[PDB]
Design a protein around this ligand. Structure first.
Ligand code: ACV
Ligand code: FE
Length: 328
């Protein structure tokens, strides 16, 4: 029943050249990462009003025909090459959530990872421009807008851990990042399908069960409806909503790299009967990216943990999350 301490951090110095100001932001990122694991990034410079409005226009105007045409393999056997990118359909009376996922716009048929058929790389699919004017242009621009914000946040995390500010960001590149945007619609439904509600061990009704994120960090915009909870030793705590800020947390690749110094917080989504948006950007590195693990608690930083290539981590992590928490 209690509320999580989720600080609001002004991240604007991370876009600048005042090095001491950057360190003061890094200290706040460190403090939040060692407490509940969540913070809100404010003063981030992204037009989140336009994001929410264009996402709503898309979700509310797409038709069943278009959803089949864009559907991932789980919903359309014809689309064997769409495991990640495309439309994730709701199932009326059974499954409420629906979403649209897209990847690096630089993944084209020309791209070498696409020509090589490397797992987790796909070419995006888009709706018809004449039915959804300007949607693809908006979505591709948004990808690079939130890429820029994430690059800045990664400098803060690096400084927080005592590393040079490009320690993570040097692996986060426009030509090969596996980062994804997911545009999730959580609808208002009356009656709400009981099959779409899960009951937690503690009795709480949920839309999505406990999990750690498959990411380096997760950069999340949500509309102003409270839904997230974070697990602490004393139980789950509510995360207050803020539809002007981005909610940030670490994923399990950060926990691995840091020998669990920055844990990947376990969190879950409460069931709320309300029309709302959940728009995550999953900060993923490149397929071949490897960061040597270190232990910030040790003077010498020595860690015995194996370096893990990001591509293998991502492939395994996405499948495991489907197996554990269900096809979304
Ligand atoms: C908790 C939110 C981030 C959101 N949940 C989610 O987005 C959940 C848990 S982090 N994430 C996923 O299912 C992984 C999507 C990965 C994506 N298809 C890809 O190929 O990269 C929700 O609102 O349900
Ligand atoms: Fe999550």
């Amino acid at each position: 029943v209690s509320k999580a301490n989720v600080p609001k951090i002004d991240v604007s110095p991370l876009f600048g050249d005042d090095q001491a100001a950057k360190m003061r932001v890094a200290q706040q990122i460190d403090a939040a990462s060692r407490d509940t694991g969540f913070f809100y990034a404010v003063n981030h410079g992204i037009n989140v009003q336009r994001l929410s409005q264009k996402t709503k226009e898309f979700h509310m105007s797409i038709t069943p025909e278009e959803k089949w045409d864009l559907a991932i393999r789980a919903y359309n056997k014809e689309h064997q090459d769409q495991v990640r990118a495309g439309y994730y359909l709701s199932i009326p009376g059974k499954k409420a959530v629906e979403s649209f996922c897209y990847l690096n716009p630089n993944f084209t048929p020309d791209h070498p990872r696409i020509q090589a058929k490397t797992p987790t790389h796909e070419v995006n699919v888009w709706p018809d421009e004449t039915k959804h004017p300007g949607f693809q242009d908006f979505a591709e621009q948004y990808y690079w807008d939130v890429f820029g914000l994430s690059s800045a946040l990664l400098k803060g995390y690096a400084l927080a851990l005592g590393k040079e500010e490009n320690f993570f960001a040097r692996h986060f590149k426009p030509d090969d990042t596996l980062a994804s945007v997911v545009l999730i619609r959580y609808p208002y439904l009356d009656p709400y399908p009981e099959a779409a509600i899960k009951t937690a061990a503690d009795g709480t009704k949920l839309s999505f069960e406990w999990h750690e994120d498959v990411s380096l960090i997760t950069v999340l915009y949500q509309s102003n409806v409270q839904n997230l909870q974070v697990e602490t030793a004393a139980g789950y705590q509510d995360i207050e909503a803020d539809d002007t800020g981005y909610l940030i947390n670490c994923g399990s690749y950060m926990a691995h790299l840091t020998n669990n110094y920055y844990k990947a917080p376990i969190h879950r989504v409460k069931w709320v009967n309300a029309e709302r948006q959940s728009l995550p950007f999953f900060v993923n590195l490149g397929y071949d990216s490897v960061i040597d693990p270190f232990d910030p608690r040790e003077p010498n930083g020595k860690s015995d943990r194996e370096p893990l290539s990001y591509g293998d981590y991502l492939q395994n992590g996405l499948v495991s999350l489907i197996n554990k928490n269900g096809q979304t």
